[PDB]
Amino acid sequence: MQIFVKTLTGKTITLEVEPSDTIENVKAKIQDKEGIPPDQQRLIFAGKQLEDGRTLSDYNIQKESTLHLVLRLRGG
């Protein structure tokens, strides 16, 4: 099933995913596509960061849901 990932500035990256697979599986597509490594990738649904080793069903992320892609540098 597909979701939507939005970058900082506001490019939308349409992205396909499997709901009982993990956030790591989401990140490996983003990492193929754009090329940000998964430590530097930070995916925000709403105002929670999604944990790595959990599924999309855990968070309750579904078809045609918007995730926001911002980065991880050093400070925060």
> What are the distances in angstroms from CA 3 to CA 12, 31, 46?
10, 16, 14
DSSP character string of 31-42: HHHT---TTTEE
Adjacent-strand bridge partners of 14: 4
Rounded CA gap, 27 and 36, in Å?
9
Instruction: Return the CATH number of the domain spanning residue range 1-76.
Output: 3.10.20.90
Rounded CA gap, 59 and 75, in Å?
26
* Method by which the model was determined: NMR
Domain boundaries of the chain, sorted by first residue:
1-76
